Scaffold this active site. Sequence first.
Site, short mmCIF file in Angstrom:
data_model
loop_
_atom_site.label_atom_id
_atom_site.label_comp_id
_atom_site.label_asym_id
_atom_site.label_seq_id
_atom_site.Cartn_x
_atom_site.Cartn_y
_atom_site.Cartn_z
N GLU A 149 0.86 -1.18 0.00
CA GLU A 149 0.00 0.00 0.00
C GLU A 149 0.90 1.23 0.00
OE1 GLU A 149 -2.55 -0.10 3.18
OE2 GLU A 149 -3.70 1.74 2.64
N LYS A 164 0.78 5.70 -1.37
CA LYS A 164 -0.03 6.89 -1.54
C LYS A 164 -1.21 6.75 -2.54
CE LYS A 164 3.11 8.80 -5.21
NZ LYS A 164 3.79 10.02 -5.86
N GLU A 165 -1.05 5.92 -3.57
CA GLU A 165 -2.00 5.84 -4.69
C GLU A 165 -2.98 4.62 -4.68
OE1 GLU A 165 -2.37 3.90 -7.94
OE2 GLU A 165 -4.11 5.36 -8.31
N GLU A 183 -2.80 -9.81 -13.25
CA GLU A 183 -1.77 -10.83 -13.05
C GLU A 183 -0.81 -10.51 -11.95
OE1 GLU A 183 0.63 -11.34 -16.54
OE2 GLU A 183 1.61 -13.11 -15.69
N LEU A 184 -0.43 -11.47 -11.12
CA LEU A 184 0.64 -11.27 -10.15
C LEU A 184 1.94 -11.42 -10.91
CD1 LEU A 184 1.87 -13.64 -7.30
CD2 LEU A 184 2.41 -11.20 -7.53
N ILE A 185 2.80 -10.43 -10.86
CA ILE A 185 4.10 -10.59 -11.51
C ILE A 185 5.08 -10.85 -10.38
CG2 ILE A 185 5.95 -9.49 -12.80
CD1 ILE A 185 3.78 -7.99 -14.25
N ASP A 186 5.75 -11.97 -10.46
CA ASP A 186 6.77 -12.31 -9.47
C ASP A 186 8.14 -11.76 -9.86
OD1 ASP A 186 7.67 -13.68 -7.17
OD2 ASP A 186 8.56 -15.22 -8.53
N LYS A 225 10.83 -8.08 -8.50
CA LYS A 225 10.97 -7.01 -7.51
C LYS A 225 11.08 -5.68 -8.28
CE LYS A 225 13.93 -10.13 -4.54
NZ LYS A 225 12.54 -10.58 -4.00
N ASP A 235 4.32 8.07 -15.26
CA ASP A 235 5.03 8.21 -14.00
C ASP A 235 6.14 7.22 -13.87
OD1 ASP A 235 5.26 9.23 -11.35
OD2 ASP A 235 4.31 7.41 -10.55
#
Length: 269
Positions: A100, A102-103, A167-170, A172, A205
Amino acid sequence: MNIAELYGKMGKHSWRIMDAIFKNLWDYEYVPLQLISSHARIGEEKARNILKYLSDLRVVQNRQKDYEGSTFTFIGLSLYSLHRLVRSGKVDAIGKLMGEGKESAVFNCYSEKFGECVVKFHKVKVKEHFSVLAIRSARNEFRALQKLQGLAVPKVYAWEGNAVLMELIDAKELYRVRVENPDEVLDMILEEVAKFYHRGIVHGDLSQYNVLVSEEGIWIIDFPQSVEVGEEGWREILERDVRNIITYFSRTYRTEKDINSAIDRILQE
């Protein structure tokens, strides 16, 4: 209280009250009780009682300065958007918070159709309306993602309210990875920027916090501020993405890429 437990505290009448707020956000910040009542087909005194309890659960915010009206909190809009995802059969169970800022708040979730994925709940003329703006942020990310499918971005599954299921991208964030081929990683990011641009999209951004890296490759995430090529300021927004990412590489790695050429190369395609 976790969002799963909160969800369990909702009855059908609770969801009907929230549906009535949601559907009247287009012309009120604070939806008048009388319209919540009439849209939901729940009598005023009972609607009031529901709204008081939702407020105690921090799902809505009730005000009475000028009139008895209600709107969603961030928690409440998110919970409602999740409900829409659950009723559409896109999500089966919300899981643990992944992170989590700011956005947005991003949660893990599981879907029989899409597998183990994430649901991202979005927050936030005349430089100086929480729900309408959050819902616009979410829909903007969604449409961007749809327009970029097949490139190095998450697969996107659904959008309801302030929620985008993807999708969860694994991998970093770049800022946590020391890479040993920074020149080639920078070039791969700039190529993907050029691919976005040929699709008519500017990210808006781009940074070390929204480029993900693993030995496999890079991915780019987080499109709520993205714009279409042709929209006001798009070229300067693009230039800023290029400049910022190149600056990041120069400061961290002393990469020697020239910003104006890099911008010029992308734009001439």
